[PDB]
């Protein structure tokens, strides 16, 4: 019923295969690099603006496929910072498309509240036209408290800009006294990305023949099933999506083993780093020579606890700063 998710059920064959794969592990979060719109427009002999508009139609149809498959969170690469280097005519065309597609979202409100659709827009959003920022902000504010499904539009986004911003936020926390520099950790950087509300994608899909990530979710897709498919994005089918899920299911056991051992090893190296730090403060100022009193055990438990409360207080400030939005008004 809405303009951002098409209304339609799976056909018999799609439903049947879906039922079969749903007997195994299913992805929770799928990320799309929607690529090939312009080649598709040239192929059909239509204007490049119609290639991109067909691209939005395929998005809405694909979110319906995910929702029918029980995949409730989707991240899409809608506009790169690098895309600002296209012609004004083409850049204008994409901003105009976003102006039209957003706001249509707003007209279709309550229908979003009915389906529980939370819409997040992630990127260095200050480079967008001011009107587009206010309209993005209104859509994000309205769907803030919805949780039946999640769509993350990466607009004016690159991964390096996202990662550089996450460091800057951690540096801001140090500058304001919320954190010590020793509090920085891989898990802390996770919580300072724009994607911090969602788990890392199970699958990265990139369409058209390109076998590169193009500055998209580099941090987040380090252990994700990577699927490169030749199809141009406006011609994406249910079966392209199905094939990608089959790829995920084939990799799942080894990819989870690797994911588990990475986390097992990262925590083990953090224990060694803190164990040596507890000894450094213990080797200094007298000698430990302990022992039954379990002094090192208490200093280590107190070390992580005081570290936990600092980062927890730091994040409440970071969300508060991110929630402060004159733009929704």
């Amino acid at each position: 019923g809405m303009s951002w998710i098409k209304e339609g059920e799976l056909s018999l064959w799609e439903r049947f295969c879906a039922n079969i794969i749903k007997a195994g592990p299913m992805p929770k979060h799928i990320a799309f690099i929607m690529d090939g719109n312009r080649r598709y427009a040239k192929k059909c002999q239509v204007e490049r603006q119609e290639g991109h508009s067909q691209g939005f139609n395929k998005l809405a149809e694909t979110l319906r496929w995910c929702l029918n498959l029980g995949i409730l969170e989707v991240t899409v690469y809608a506009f790169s910072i690098e895309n600002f280097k296209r012609s004004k005519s083409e850049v204008d065309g994409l901003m105009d498309l976003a102006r039209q597609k957003f706001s249509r979202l707003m007209e279709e409100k309550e229908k979003l509240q009915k389906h529980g659709v939370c819409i997040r827009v992630l990127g260095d959003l200050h480079l967008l036209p001011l009107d587009l920022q206010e309209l993005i902000a209104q859509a994000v504010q309205a769907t803030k408290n919805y949780n039946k499904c999640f769509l993350n539009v990466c607009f004016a986004y690159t991964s390096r800009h996202e990662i550089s911003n996450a460091v800057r936020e951690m540096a801001w926390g140090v500058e304001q006294g919320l954190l010590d520099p020793s509090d920085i950790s891989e898990s802390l950087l996770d919580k300072c990305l724009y994607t911090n509300r969602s788990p890392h994608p199970d699958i990265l899909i990139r369409t058209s023949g390109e076998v590169r990530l193009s500055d998209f979710l580099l941090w987040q897709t380090s252990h994700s099933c990577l699927v490169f498919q030749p199809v141009l994005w406006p011609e994406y089918t249910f079966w392209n999506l199905f094939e990608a899920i089959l790829q995920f299911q084939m990799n799942h056991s080894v990819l989870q083993k690797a994911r588990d051992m990475y986390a097992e090893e990262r925590k083990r190296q953090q224990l060694e780093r803190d164990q040596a730090t507890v000894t450094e403060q213990l080797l200094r100022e007298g000698l430990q020579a302990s022992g039954d009193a379990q002094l090192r055990r208490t200093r280590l438990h107190k070390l992580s606890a005081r570290r936990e409360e600092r980062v927890q207080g730091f994040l409440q400030a970071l969300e508060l700063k991110r929630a402060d939005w004159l733009a929704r008004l």
Partner: protein, 198 residues
């Protein structure tokens, strides 16, 4: 002579383009590591003209067995002044592991946040160009091409920051890799096209 050095150089020069930095991601670790196959790939890149080669596995086996790998490289490099041959491979070859990716970006964040604490730098002074120069590979280019071997469809935490534009070509196994297979992947990279957002 050998000779053979000229033939391999003519192969690299015939391609539309060649990687300056190449990564070798091994996604399946063999019980007794196949250093000879890995060493053959490294020697082929050097013979065809690739300046930097990074060897990677998610469990850090090649990093734990570093000297056995360099030994095999230098043995295979003699066929087709040892100190000059040794340092030439220490400078062109790096053996990487997960800690060289996300753990290194965290190391750079701690050091910069250490300077914000000492009033030597401001958070706003960290753009993407500054962060790039603060990483371990500050004086070495990003990988142009990655050859990924084995059955896993993931980079498995390899240099997440540096592979933003790396072409990723997949081969099912490195276990008896032939020059023709390796050079076929080079032809794929040579034909790749990067429009840089445009």
């Amino acid at each position: 002579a050998a000779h053979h050095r000229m033939r391999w150089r003519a192969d690299g020069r015939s391609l539309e383009k060649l990687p300056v930095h190449m990564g070798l991601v091994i996604t399946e670790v063999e019980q007794e590591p196949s250093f000879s196959d890995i060493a053959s790939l490294v020697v082929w890149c050097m013979a065809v003209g690739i300046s930097y080669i990074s060897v990677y596995d998610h469990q850090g086996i090649f990093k734990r067995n570093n000297s056995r790998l360099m030994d095999e490289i230098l043995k295979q490099q003699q066929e087709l002044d040892k100190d000059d041959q040794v340092l030439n491979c220490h400078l062109a070859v790096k053996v990487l592991s997960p800690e060289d990716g996300k753990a290194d970006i965290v190391r750079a964040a701690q050091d910069f946040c250490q300077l914000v604490a000492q009033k030597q730098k401001r958070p706003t002074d960290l753009d993407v160009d500054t962060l790039a120069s603060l990483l371990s590979s500050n004086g070495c280019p990003d990988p142009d091409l990655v050859l990924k071997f084995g059955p896993v469809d993931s980079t498995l935490g390899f240099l997440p920051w540096h592979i933003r534009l790396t072409e990723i070509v997949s081969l099912p196994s490195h276990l008896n890799i032939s020059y023709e297979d390796f050079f076929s992947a080079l032809r794929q990279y040579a034909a790749c096209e990067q429009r840089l957002g445009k």
